[PDB]
Amino acid sequence: SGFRKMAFPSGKVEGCMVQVTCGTTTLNGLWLDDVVYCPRHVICTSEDMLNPNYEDLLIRKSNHNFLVQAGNVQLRVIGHSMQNCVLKLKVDTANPKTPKYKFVRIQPGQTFSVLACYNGSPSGVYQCAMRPNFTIKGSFLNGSCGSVGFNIDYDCVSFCYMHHMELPTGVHAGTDLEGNFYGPFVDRQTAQAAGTDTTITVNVLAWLYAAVINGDRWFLNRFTTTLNDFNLVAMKYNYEPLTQDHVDILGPLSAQTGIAVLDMCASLKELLQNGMNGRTILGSALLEDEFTPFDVVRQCSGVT
Amino acid sequence: SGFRKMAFPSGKVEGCMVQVTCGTTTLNGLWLDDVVYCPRHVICTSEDMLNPNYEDLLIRKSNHNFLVQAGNVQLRVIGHSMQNCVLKLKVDTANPKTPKYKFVRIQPGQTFSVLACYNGSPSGVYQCAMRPNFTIKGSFLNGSCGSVGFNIDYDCVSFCYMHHMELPTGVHAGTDLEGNFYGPFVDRQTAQAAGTDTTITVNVLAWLYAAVINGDRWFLNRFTTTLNDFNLVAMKYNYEPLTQDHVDILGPLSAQTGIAVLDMCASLKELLQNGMNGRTILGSALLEDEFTPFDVVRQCSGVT
Ligand SMILES: *[C@H](O)[C@H](C[C@@H]1CCNC1=O)NC(=O)[C@H](CC(C)C)NC(=O)OCc1ccccc1
Ligand SMILES: *[C@H](O)[C@H](C[C@@H]1CCNC1=O)NC(=O)[C@H](CC(C)C)NC(=O)OCc1ccccc1
Ligand SMILES: [Cl-]
Ligand SMILES: [Cl-]
Ligand SMILES: [Cl-]
Ligand SMILES: [K+]
Ligand SMILES: [K+]
Ligand code: NA
Ligand code: NA
């Protein structure tokens, strides 16, 4: 038993990280088959980043202006093109460690593992949720751009995120692997708002079920509620509305615990109104919303 | 910026996990050079585990009674021996993916990454601290034994933990890679006490410095204190005593922030006495003690 925020094993993705340098700017690239993917602001100087015209900047760059380094070795860049906010560098060598992979655009509320890298080398791995406002709460320093987010299913890596920038609130923003930002953001160093960050209600309920599965049961109260009545509570607290789709997704955890989803909703309502009175749930004094129902099921069933 | 619990990249350790089966019992083994390391209770039936005589049980086992599987392939077991609570199986093939490695016995308060595995296959990675009472708060199900804890320095994996059991409190216990338990525990399915779990004071202070580095400063008060006066506070709350060795270890974070260590101690004292009044520090409503000063420095400096 026990319940922990846990990332996927990172080995398949470590084999795909390279270093990309253009002029003075160095960042990380993702090397799959004979293409290296990286954020297009690798072509910017510090001044450019304030207000970049990426088309005009890129037109001054040739293949040989991109230095791509895999460990000790230089890759030869044989072509380049910009797709939305990502740059694709064609190289003369297919990555021999390319795993089976696909590119996915993930939904708000879903989670993924970040392999944080600097200079093409992995530094650590942690789990993030795509928030409903399309930001993530990561840990990123200068040089971390091009670090990627991913999920594993069996032996297929599903890449879903590439890191580009930090917002004034300290949260993080990036694109899918087609270079399209999650959220309303642009890759320019100007102040940008993500708007109200709402709580992923279905995830909090999955985490409460995780707490019950692991013996934490003090917060279970004697009430039930309805969906419409709960959502009137939910929206007062900037929680996302709960739907029958969410109820069904929670079905298996509801069955494991014998706790109806609407019974758990009433338990959540009283936590929202009364707080936790200094108690803890799974070692936290906040309600946690970055575990999906699948995250709870896979952790509590030993999926490999 | 941002601060997250993050594990080391797991790729070097994934290449060392195998499956070990003896009779009906299956668990994980660590394959380095021509030796596989695993918990000795792989030789027990369910009944044996209640009160095992490991010497007598092992004497009924021959090399061919240990099935060791690396992916699809069987390894041939050419010898075996018990070292404390671990079994060493000599195999006829050196692991071609053996990384540079060593075995270390870690100190209470230090952290490490767990690569949780089932059936020889990695399932996820998370960070743990060796608590002062020599338990860890992990996430482990049946079949997870032989999962290992490790740290990376450059390209050397330092293995420090192998998983063996769960205590009645839900915390976890295991050995170093020489098979010696951390703590007073024995590998028998009988109720065992770990005793009072005290808080890793130097780690809480490192985490408060991490909070300041990342812009969280509301808890800084106008007081200072002394070591002896703080430790009178510390011991009332089951915190570990703070020493000049800890002060010096915190030196670099103290310098980064301009906050004297004893000033931060006085800030901690008021948090201990008054609580957090519903505020949060680095997104937590508890004081976090599973980040070492080195963990904070390495995260806040981009070490790879
Ligand atoms: C890519 O490595 C970088 C990641 C920033 C590093 C600071 N924390 C991060 O997540 N991205 C940028 O520097 C980005 C470049 C623009 C052309 C989009 N600019 C940026 O994020 O400005 C915010 C910022 C905050 C704190 C320090 C530096 C920049
Ligand atoms: C090795 O896979 C296993 C790990 C236990 C799995 C339950 N959670 C764990 O961490 N170890 C044992 O089953 C251990 C074997 C003895 C010979 C030491 N026994 C054990 O941990 O008993 C506690 C327990 C708690 C909950 C379920 C099963 C066992
Ligand atoms: Cl665009
Ligand atoms: Cl965490
Ligand atoms: Cl022993
Ligand atoms: K209820
Ligand atoms: K102070
Ligand atoms: Na897209
Ligand atoms: Na030892």
XYZ file of C-alpha atoms and ligand atoms in Angstrom:
673
model
C 0.000 0.000 0.000
C 1.014 3.647 -0.019
C 0.340 6.273 -2.650
C 2.991 8.474 -4.290
C 3.304 10.925 -7.162
C 5.322 8.790 -9.577
C 6.685 9.339 -13.068
C 7.101 6.831 -15.837
C 10.532 5.230 -16.262
C 12.494 7.671 -18.372
C 14.961 5.392 -20.172
C 13.209 5.366 -23.553
C 13.104 9.190 -23.590
C 16.670 9.694 -22.327
C 17.838 8.034 -25.517
C 16.202 10.807 -27.575
C 17.601 13.957 -25.949
C 20.195 16.031 -27.790
C 21.678 19.509 -27.542
C 20.797 22.176 -30.134
C 22.846 25.385 -30.383
C 22.220 28.313 -32.710
C 24.601 31.202 -32.152
C 24.791 31.836 -28.415
C 21.461 30.134 -27.595
C 21.593 26.485 -26.474
C 18.610 24.275 -25.560
C 17.335 20.696 -25.776
C 16.114 18.832 -28.817
C 14.136 15.605 -29.265
C 15.770 13.225 -31.789
C 13.385 10.705 -33.352
C 14.202 8.911 -36.624
C 16.110 11.531 -38.712
C 14.406 14.656 -37.286
C 15.330 16.802 -34.281
C 12.447 18.798 -32.756
C 13.144 21.892 -30.647
C 11.586 25.255 -29.703
C 11.937 27.812 -32.459
C 13.276 30.536 -30.082
C 16.660 28.795 -30.255
C 17.230 31.204 -33.183
C 16.681 34.301 -31.015
C 19.204 36.462 -29.285
C 18.192 37.875 -25.921
C 17.037 41.079 -27.621
C 15.050 39.161 -30.275
C 13.013 37.402 -27.596
C 11.302 40.656 -26.592
C 9.411 40.874 -29.902
C 10.523 38.195 -32.384
C 9.558 38.070 -36.042
C 10.318 34.389 -36.380
C 9.945 34.247 -40.170
C 12.477 37.051 -40.661
C 14.861 35.622 -38.043
C 14.768 32.105 -39.521
C 15.462 33.350 -43.073
C 18.939 34.420 -41.908
C 19.728 30.841 -40.762
C 21.123 27.958 -42.824
C 21.444 24.266 -42.004
C 25.057 24.750 -40.828
C 23.999 27.394 -38.283
C 22.334 24.665 -36.169
C 24.778 22.640 -34.067
C 23.166 19.393 -32.937
C 25.158 17.291 -30.492
C 24.282 13.760 -29.323
C 26.685 13.084 -26.477
C 30.175 13.553 -27.964
C 29.079 13.435 -31.617
C 27.899 16.147 -34.002
C 24.865 15.362 -36.135
C 24.889 16.813 -39.638
C 21.847 19.028 -40.285
C 20.590 18.489 -43.838
C 17.402 20.546 -43.772
C 15.212 22.639 -41.567
C 11.694 23.972 -41.326
C 9.438 25.745 -38.859
C 6.111 24.129 -37.900
C 4.122 26.500 -35.662
C 6.386 27.206 -32.643
C 8.745 24.249 -33.202
C 11.737 23.890 -35.461
C 12.374 20.550 -37.205
C 15.987 19.863 -38.141
C 16.499 17.008 -40.570
C 19.738 15.144 -39.845
C 21.675 12.577 -41.866
C 21.461 9.859 -39.190
C 18.350 8.215 -37.746
C 18.464 7.927 -33.969
C 19.314 4.237 -33.355
C 17.555 4.478 -29.986
C 14.273 5.785 -31.420
C 11.527 4.049 -29.422
C 8.106 3.237 -30.763
C 6.329 6.586 -30.378
C 3.527 8.900 -31.325
C 2.616 12.562 -30.906
C -0.540 13.297 -28.924
C -2.247 16.501 -27.894
C -3.315 15.940 -24.322
C -6.550 17.098 -22.612
C -6.675 19.479 -19.646
C -6.727 17.437 -16.456
C -4.565 14.621 -17.861
C -1.114 13.955 -16.457
C 2.318 13.232 -17.930
C 5.965 12.802 -16.948
C 8.500 15.575 -17.604
C 12.111 14.656 -18.245
C 13.846 17.908 -17.305
C 17.071 18.395 -19.287
C 19.932 20.905 -19.622
C 22.466 20.883 -22.483
C 20.931 17.737 -23.940
C 21.420 15.755 -20.696
C 18.617 14.509 -18.416
C 18.470 16.038 -14.968
C 15.374 14.517 -13.360
C 11.831 13.361 -13.869
C 8.568 14.502 -12.334
C 4.825 14.244 -12.952
C 2.647 17.176 -14.128
C -1.001 17.764 -14.928
C -2.123 19.933 -17.797
C -4.193 22.388 -15.757
C -7.633 23.494 -16.978
C -6.022 26.826 -17.860
C -3.388 25.010 -19.976
C -0.389 25.715 -17.732
C 1.717 23.283 -15.746
C 3.400 23.680 -12.384
C 6.882 22.512 -13.244
C 10.493 23.127 -12.233
C 12.409 24.741 -15.116
C 15.535 26.943 -15.288
C 17.221 28.719 -18.171
C 18.305 26.114 -20.695
C 15.447 23.703 -19.931
C 13.429 24.504 -23.076
C 12.911 21.515 -25.355
C 12.527 19.221 -22.343
C 9.494 17.014 -23.149
C 6.433 15.560 -21.421
C 5.315 12.026 -22.224
C 3.248 8.997 -21.256
C 4.157 5.318 -21.786
C 1.679 2.644 -22.857
C 3.432 -0.750 -22.863
C 6.384 0.073 -25.153
C 4.983 3.120 -27.010
C 6.085 6.587 -25.851
C 3.344 9.186 -26.402
C 4.999 12.607 -26.480
C 2.571 15.344 -25.502
C 4.526 18.437 -24.352
C 7.621 20.478 -25.174
C 8.706 23.217 -22.773
C 8.941 26.852 -23.970
C 8.432 29.473 -21.260
C 7.567 30.644 -17.743
C 4.618 32.974 -16.985
C 4.781 35.814 -14.425
C 2.886 33.654 -11.938
C 5.715 31.084 -11.976
C 3.724 28.419 -13.862
C 4.946 26.982 -17.145
C 3.758 26.925 -20.752
C 4.629 24.937 -23.842
C 3.471 23.203 -26.981
C 2.541 19.815 -28.311
C 5.053 18.213 -30.613
C 3.458 19.907 -33.610
C 4.475 23.220 -32.044
C 0.982 24.405 -31.103
C 0.794 25.980 -27.678
C -1.473 24.644 -25.033
C -3.448 27.725 -24.036
C -3.533 31.289 -25.310
C 0.232 31.834 -25.101
C 2.766 33.058 -27.683
C 6.539 32.564 -27.633
C 7.475 36.149 -26.900
C 9.033 37.519 -23.695
C 6.096 39.717 -22.809
C 3.764 39.438 -19.830
C 0.938 36.940 -20.479
C -2.085 35.860 -18.446
C -3.368 32.318 -18.074
C -6.566 33.273 -16.275
C -8.305 31.592 -13.400
C -6.897 28.166 -12.519
C -9.735 25.843 -11.651
C -9.449 22.587 -9.726
C -9.733 19.249 -11.542
C -12.743 17.865 -9.680
C -12.634 14.343 -11.100
C -8.963 14.107 -10.049
C -9.669 15.198 -6.458
C -12.352 12.507 -6.267
C -9.938 9.899 -7.631
C -7.410 10.963 -4.992
C -10.035 10.668 -2.216
C -10.764 7.137 -3.457
C -7.020 6.479 -3.378
C -7.027 7.650 0.229
C -9.810 5.233 1.138
C -8.116 2.311 -0.664
C -5.021 3.015 1.475
C -6.925 3.183 4.788
C -7.588 6.954 5.128
C -11.315 7.243 5.888
C -11.964 10.010 8.490
C -13.463 12.426 5.929
C -16.265 10.109 4.824
C -19.484 11.711 6.039
C -23.095 10.506 6.301
C -24.478 12.615 3.458
C -25.059 12.250 -0.222
C -25.906 14.816 -2.875
C -26.886 15.265 -6.529
C -24.788 16.307 -9.511
C -26.562 19.649 -9.943
C -26.356 20.425 -6.231
C -22.694 19.422 -6.076
C -21.843 21.542 -9.122
C -23.442 24.553 -7.428
C -20.956 23.888 -4.632
C -18.161 23.104 -7.091
C -18.410 26.333 -9.071
C -18.406 28.476 -5.918
C -14.903 27.087 -5.205
C -13.576 27.266 -8.785
C -13.847 23.501 -9.192
C -14.590 22.084 -12.627
C -18.143 20.767 -13.078
C -18.680 17.028 -12.635
C -20.424 15.060 -15.414
C -21.794 11.541 -15.820
C -18.715 10.862 -17.951
C -16.633 11.560 -14.824
C -18.977 9.433 -12.695
C -18.461 6.521 -15.098
C -14.697 7.015 -15.185
C -14.738 6.783 -11.402
C -16.924 3.646 -11.615
C -14.127 1.141 -10.954
C -12.813 3.054 -7.905
C -16.365 3.445 -6.639
C -16.701 -0.337 -6.931
C -13.386 -1.071 -5.208
C -14.393 1.072 -2.217
C -18.161 0.547 -2.135
C -18.547 4.338 -2.019
C -21.014 5.820 -4.484
C -19.553 8.707 -6.475
C -22.281 11.074 -5.261
C -21.584 9.991 -1.667
C -17.952 10.954 -2.182
C -19.115 14.266 -3.659
C -20.982 15.054 -0.452
C -17.814 14.202 1.494
C -15.865 16.604 -0.726
C -18.461 19.375 -0.248
C -17.955 19.305 3.523
C -14.172 19.345 3.071
C -14.585 22.408 0.842
C -16.871 24.192 3.318
C -15.158 23.179 6.576
C -11.550 22.491 5.632
C -9.466 19.653 6.976
C -9.320 20.854 10.605
C -5.576 20.173 10.676
C -5.913 16.566 9.569
C -4.157 15.147 6.517
C -5.174 12.900 3.626
C -2.422 10.726 2.125
C 0.110 12.921 3.893
C -1.258 16.165 2.418
C -3.056 19.070 4.076
C -4.520 20.246 0.737
C -6.899 18.522 -1.658
C -4.713 17.082 -4.442
C -5.918 17.351 -8.040
C -2.996 16.110 -10.141
C -3.872 12.390 -10.008
C -6.183 11.060 -12.734
C -8.511 8.099 -12.152
C -6.166 6.115 -14.403
C -3.143 7.229 -12.337
C -4.859 5.952 -9.187
C -5.901 2.653 -10.784
C -2.490 2.010 -12.348
C -0.655 2.777 -9.114
C -3.045 0.712 -6.981
C -2.859 -2.287 -9.408
C 0.880 -2.509 -10.221
C 0.754 -1.829 -13.976
C 4.167 -2.104 -15.657
C 11.778 28.714 -11.242
C 9.453 26.270 -9.527
C 10.309 23.476 -7.133
C 9.227 19.837 -7.521
C 9.928 16.458 -5.960
C 11.953 14.888 -8.770
C 13.650 11.535 -9.235
C 16.820 10.757 -11.101
C 16.493 9.514 -14.688
C 15.928 5.793 -14.384
C 17.382 4.479 -17.652
C 20.640 3.126 -16.216
C 18.715 1.161 -13.557
C 15.988 -0.111 -15.904
C 18.701 -2.008 -17.731
C 19.473 -3.989 -14.556
C 16.030 -5.265 -13.539
C 15.187 -8.943 -13.961
C 12.550 -11.365 -12.718
C 13.445 -14.045 -10.145
C 11.073 -16.957 -9.477
C 11.527 -19.728 -6.928
C 8.583 -22.102 -6.759
C 5.418 -20.010 -6.651
C 7.136 -16.830 -5.387
C 8.159 -14.239 -8.000
C 9.922 -10.912 -7.338
C 12.499 -8.525 -8.804
C 16.236 -8.968 -9.016
C 19.102 -6.554 -9.716
C 21.500 -7.868 -12.403
C 24.993 -6.363 -12.273
C 27.988 -8.061 -13.927
C 27.337 -11.833 -13.465
C 25.388 -11.612 -10.169
C 21.657 -11.187 -9.546
C 20.733 -9.693 -6.150
C 17.265 -10.248 -4.676
C 15.484 -10.551 -1.305
C 16.028 -13.929 0.295
C 12.279 -14.445 1.032
C 11.860 -15.420 -2.626
C 12.513 -18.950 -1.280
C 9.536 -18.816 1.109
C 6.048 -20.094 0.627
C 3.269 -18.032 2.164
C 3.344 -20.247 5.259
C 7.155 -20.001 5.555
C 6.977 -16.212 5.739
C 5.275 -16.339 9.146
C 8.413 -17.698 10.846
C 11.160 -18.557 8.338
C 14.335 -20.456 9.141
C 16.178 -19.161 6.113
C 19.204 -21.449 6.474
C 17.013 -24.565 6.525
C 14.805 -23.298 3.679
C 17.769 -22.412 1.446
C 19.437 -25.820 1.946
C 16.524 -27.408 0.051
C 17.209 -25.179 -3.000
C 19.633 -25.795 -5.874
C 20.819 -23.483 -8.641
C 18.145 -24.828 -11.031
C 15.345 -23.937 -8.590
C 15.929 -20.218 -9.307
C 14.387 -19.020 -12.575
C 15.944 -15.722 -13.633
C 14.383 -14.015 -16.636
C 15.742 -10.927 -18.430
C 12.966 -9.908 -20.793
C 12.315 -12.978 -22.975
C 15.538 -14.809 -22.072
C 16.386 -17.217 -19.258
C 19.672 -16.663 -17.451
C 21.484 -19.797 -16.320
C 22.113 -19.801 -12.555
C 25.552 -21.260 -11.822
C 25.801 -20.626 -8.090
C 24.027 -19.086 -5.170
C 24.667 -17.782 -1.691
C 22.895 -15.865 1.047
C 24.464 -12.638 2.361
C 22.433 -11.326 5.319
C 18.868 -10.839 3.982
C 19.808 -10.906 0.276
C 20.372 -13.804 -2.061
C 23.125 -13.571 -4.699
C 22.619 -15.730 -7.778
C 25.678 -16.147 -9.966
C 24.724 -16.377 -13.644
C 26.719 -17.413 -16.706
C 26.259 -14.077 -18.510
C 27.393 -10.621 -17.398
C 24.712 -7.982 -17.858
C 25.820 -6.086 -21.003
C 23.971 -3.020 -19.707
C 25.757 -2.957 -16.340
C 26.373 0.731 -15.585
C 29.256 2.035 -13.549
C 27.989 1.475 -9.998
C 28.684 1.092 -6.328
C 26.856 -0.059 -3.206
C 26.370 2.542 -0.482
C 24.673 2.456 2.889
C 22.795 5.717 3.124
C 22.323 7.956 6.206
C 18.949 8.780 7.762
C 17.688 12.026 6.269
C 19.264 11.417 2.844
C 17.092 10.911 -0.214
C 17.078 8.503 -3.158
C 15.010 7.485 -6.182
C 12.955 4.272 -6.146
C 12.353 2.435 -9.395
C 9.216 0.466 -8.523
C 9.034 -2.808 -10.474
C 6.740 -5.837 -10.871
C 7.768 -9.079 -12.615
C 11.144 -7.620 -13.538
C 9.579 -4.652 -15.391
C 9.757 -1.001 -14.276
C 6.482 0.605 -13.303
C 7.424 4.101 -12.126
C 9.927 6.209 -10.273
C 9.604 8.353 -7.173
C 11.805 10.024 -4.561
C 12.077 8.839 -0.923
C 13.929 9.897 2.200
C 15.392 7.415 4.627
C 13.499 8.591 7.710
C 15.301 8.986 11.048
C 13.518 5.812 12.153
C 14.891 3.957 9.089
C 11.580 3.538 7.249
C 10.481 5.047 3.961
C 7.074 6.230 2.828
C 6.819 4.441 -0.483
C 4.200 2.917 -2.776
C 4.655 -0.871 -2.959
C 2.288 -3.767 -3.767
C 2.758 -7.520 -3.672
C 5.511 -8.430 -6.107
C 7.436 -5.164 -5.666
C 10.203 -6.650 -3.488
C 13.664 -6.359 -5.014
C 12.809 -2.929 -6.424
C 15.859 -0.738 -5.640
C 16.663 2.785 -4.450
C 19.580 4.670 -5.973
C 21.338 7.982 -6.541
C 23.258 9.070 -9.668
C 26.508 11.035 -9.596
C 27.530 11.886 -13.177
C 27.517 8.371 -14.686
C 27.897 6.259 -11.508
C 24.759 4.658 -10.036
C 24.988 4.361 -6.237
C 22.547 1.659 -5.143
C 21.443 2.159 -1.555
C 18.140 0.301 -0.964
C 16.349 -2.934 -1.827
C 12.684 -3.309 -0.893
C 11.566 -6.136 1.445
C 8.421 -5.409 3.458
C 5.592 -3.195 4.716
C 5.087 -2.359 8.424
C 1.648 -2.198 10.097
C 1.759 1.596 9.915
C 1.911 1.434 6.100
C 5.548 2.591 5.858
C 8.191 0.487 4.146
C 11.388 -1.296 5.156
C 14.327 -2.799 3.322
C 18.041 -3.408 3.156
C 21.190 -2.054 1.618
C 22.641 -4.082 -1.202
C 24.651 -6.155 1.260
C 21.330 -7.358 2.671
C 21.521 -5.517 5.998
C 18.258 -3.930 7.034
C 17.982 -0.264 7.675
C 16.490 -0.168 11.162
C 15.604 -2.843 13.690
C 13.545 -4.951 11.274
C 13.717 -8.655 10.358
C 12.316 -10.333 7.244
C 9.501 -12.198 8.939
C 5.756 -11.563 8.562
C 5.219 -10.579 12.166
C 4.174 -7.206 13.551
C 7.172 -4.865 13.977
C 7.539 -1.352 15.378
C 9.666 1.417 13.914
C 9.219 3.802 16.828
C 8.728 7.527 16.836
C 9.261 9.174 13.445
C 11.056 12.453 13.925
C 11.215 15.301 11.425
C 14.417 15.965 9.470
C 15.063 19.515 10.663
C 17.901 20.337 8.274
C 15.671 19.253 5.361
C 12.760 21.476 6.444
C 15.178 24.409 6.595
C 16.506 23.589 3.123
C 12.920 23.494 1.852
C 12.159 26.892 3.453
C 15.229 28.278 1.667
C 13.904 26.719 -1.538
C 10.639 28.547 -0.916
C 12.429 31.873 -0.541
C 14.552 31.297 -3.674
C 11.278 30.758 -5.581
C 9.570 33.900 -4.225
C 7.635 32.508 -1.208
C 8.529 34.816 1.695
C 5.448 35.467 3.915
C 6.718 33.261 6.773
C 9.946 35.187 7.325
C 9.600 36.851 10.719
C 11.589 39.542 12.552
C 13.177 37.245 15.131
C 16.329 35.256 15.489
C 17.307 32.569 17.971
C 20.185 30.381 19.172
C 20.935 26.730 18.474
C 20.271 25.621 22.056
C 17.044 27.614 22.249
C 15.878 26.329 18.868
C 16.648 22.724 19.819
C 14.516 23.131 22.947
C 11.735 24.067 20.533
C 12.753 21.357 18.064
C 12.633 18.467 20.521
C 9.190 19.474 21.812
C 7.883 18.851 18.261
C 9.855 15.650 17.577
C 12.237 17.481 15.255
C 15.826 16.290 15.012
C 18.374 18.527 16.761
C 20.231 21.058 14.612
C 24.055 21.119 14.702
C 26.781 23.396 13.356
C 27.380 20.704 10.733
C 23.817 21.364 9.520
C 24.368 25.134 9.709
C 27.436 24.762 7.479
C 25.622 22.480 5.045
C 22.975 25.175 4.737
C 25.710 27.809 4.240
C 25.327 28.102 0.458
C 21.519 28.476 0.634
C 21.910 30.980 3.453
C 24.244 32.932 1.164
C 21.932 32.747 -1.856
C 19.044 34.173 0.187
C 20.878 36.469 2.604
C 18.980 34.771 5.441
C 21.083 33.622 8.377
C 20.414 30.010 9.344
C 19.458 31.019 12.892
C 17.076 33.644 11.475
C 15.390 30.898 9.475
C 15.249 28.782 12.637
C 13.279 31.509 14.390
C 10.929 31.614 11.388
C 10.471 27.844 11.681
C 9.789 28.077 15.439
C 6.831 30.394 14.838
C 5.515 28.093 12.101
C 5.735 25.206 14.579
C 3.964 27.140 17.347
C 1.357 28.973 15.245
C 0.859 26.811 12.169
C 0.454 28.111 8.655
C -2.909 29.856 9.183
C -4.216 28.306 5.963
C -1.373 29.616 3.831
C 0.860 27.380 1.726
C 4.599 27.133 1.098
C 5.656 25.817 -2.323
C 2.119 24.544 -2.792
C 2.100 22.570 0.476
C 0.136 23.112 3.681
C 2.611 21.009 5.713
C 6.298 21.535 6.416
C 8.159 19.266 3.969
C 11.188 17.327 5.211
C 12.126 15.031 2.322
C 14.347 17.519 0.451
C 18.042 17.580 1.386
C 20.161 20.733 1.075
C 21.846 19.024 -1.882
C 18.442 18.259 -3.456
C 17.528 21.946 -3.206
C 20.874 23.134 -4.588
C 20.894 20.633 -7.459
C 17.322 21.458 -8.448
C 17.858 25.222 -8.184
C 21.131 25.051 -10.227
C 20.237 22.666 -13.092
C 22.702 19.844 -12.359
C 22.614 17.071 -14.978
C 13.711 28.007 -22.324
O 14.849 27.387 -21.695
C 13.187 29.093 -21.350
C 12.604 28.467 -20.053
C 12.337 29.411 -18.853
C 13.637 29.503 -18.139
C 13.216 30.401 -17.046
N 12.178 29.424 -16.579
C 11.691 28.878 -17.719
O 10.809 28.019 -17.764
N 12.263 30.037 -22.004
C 12.439 31.363 -22.020
O 13.366 31.943 -21.462
C 11.364 32.172 -22.751
C 11.857 32.526 -24.159
C 10.810 33.364 -24.918
C 11.309 33.660 -26.342
C 9.448 32.658 -24.958
N 11.204 33.387 -21.965
C 10.709 33.343 -20.724
O 10.268 32.288 -20.267
O 10.571 34.497 -20.016
C 10.181 34.251 -18.650
C 11.314 34.122 -17.810
C 11.156 33.976 -16.432
C 12.274 33.854 -15.605
C 13.557 33.875 -16.141
C 13.725 34.018 -17.512
C 12.608 34.143 -18.334
C 7.699 -8.118 -1.368
O 7.070 -7.964 -2.655
C 6.639 -7.753 -0.296
C 6.262 -6.247 -0.351
C 5.001 -5.791 0.425
C 3.868 -6.036 -0.505
C 2.775 -5.547 0.358
N 3.387 -4.180 0.441
C 4.722 -4.411 0.486
O 5.583 -3.532 0.558
N 7.026 -8.205 1.053
C 6.271 -8.999 1.819
O 5.158 -9.409 1.501
C 6.848 -9.354 3.191
C 7.489 -10.746 3.135
C 8.060 -11.148 4.508
C 8.740 -12.524 4.409
C 9.045 -10.096 5.037
N 5.705 -9.373 4.092
C 5.026 -8.255 4.367
O 5.430 -7.166 3.958
O 3.962 -8.307 5.213
C 3.252 -7.053 5.269
C 2.214 -7.011 4.307
C 1.342 -5.922 4.258
C 0.317 -5.884 3.313
C 0.148 -6.926 2.408
C 1.011 -8.014 2.447
C 2.031 -8.051 3.394
Cl 2.388 30.027 -34.430
Cl 5.367 14.848 -4.954
Cl 20.431 -11.429 8.916
K -20.694 10.894 2.280
K 13.315 35.373 11.239
Na -1.452 20.098 -32.398
Na 25.770 -2.874 4.947
